[PDB]
């Protein structure tokens, strides 16, 4: 086509989606990770995670307002990844890298798994 | 913070949101523009438009599944802007620029109004 493109549009959309999440506006699911609960938008979760894409395209699970993750999932690891989904920023640290990588593998977030593997290989 | 950032993340999220829209997955509103209907995600509309941000933060309108736009709004103009919201790409042409600019003013999409004004000024 003969379209023009606004370079910052995708980043501005994501910033606003994060603002809506922070104010709990039109959030439609709560992700339970052991004792912790995280409110989010199903569409953002699906757009970022192979696991959530699978869950919310399921004819029964698409209608659930609560999703319970595997008890082995670390809440801090999930929190870091949820922040990444809404911001493009990953808070990757020596103290959380193993939990973040395990959570990203479970959530099927290939690019995160990739940078975790590379950061681990550099430290060995 | 000491975060790392994935450059293509925002663009990849938006591409997936557009894929969900195309397959009518978790769309929660229909925008009626005279004889035409457009299915969308309320959160994407709010993230792109001052008018939709206003509408879906309203305690009554947030729950509506159908929103009727002003009868003066051109459906093609709306279609072009809805595509822009989900892709960052604006199909701006001599034959549609007046309709696109009027629709962007109504929807409160400042960056679109800005490029339309500039393209019009260049042709006079």
């Amino acid at each position: 086509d003969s379209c023009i493109q606004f370079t910052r549009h995708a980043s501005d959309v994501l910033l606003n989606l994060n603002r809506l999440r922070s104010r709990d506006i039109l959030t439609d699911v709560v992700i339970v990770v052991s004792r912790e609960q995280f409110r989010a938008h199903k569409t953002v979760l699906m757009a970022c995670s192979g696991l959530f894409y699978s869950i919310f395209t399921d004819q029964l699970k698409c209608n659930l307002s609560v999703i319970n993750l595997d008890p082995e999932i670390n809440p801090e690891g999930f929190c870091i990844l949820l922040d990444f989904m809404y911001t493009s920023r990953l808070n990757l640290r020596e103290g959380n890298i193993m939990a973040v990588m395990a959570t990203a593998m479970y959530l099927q977030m290939e690019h995160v798994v990739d940078t975790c593997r590379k950061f681990i290989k550099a430290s060995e | 913070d000491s975060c790392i950032q994935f450059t293509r993340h925002a663009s990849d999220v938006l591409l997936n949101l557009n894929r969900l829209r195309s397959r009518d997955i978790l769309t929660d509103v229909v925008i009626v523009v005279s004889r035409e209907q457009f299915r969308a995600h309320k959160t994407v509309l709010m993230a792109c438009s001052g008018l939709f941000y206003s509408i879906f933060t309203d305690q009554l309108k947030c729950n509506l599944s159908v929103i009727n736009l002003d009868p003066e709004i051109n459906p093609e103009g709306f279609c072009i802007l809805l595509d822009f919201m989900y892709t960052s790409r604006l199909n701006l042409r001599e034959g549609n620029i007046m309709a696109v600019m009027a629709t962007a003013m109504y929807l409160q999409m400042e960056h679109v109004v800005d490029t339309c004004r500039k393209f019009i000024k260049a042709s006079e």
């Binding site: 379209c3 023009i4 493109q5 | 604006l90």
Partner: peptide, 4 residues
């Protein structure tokens, strides 16, 4: 705005 750019030509993509």
């Amino acid at each position: 705005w750019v030509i993509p």
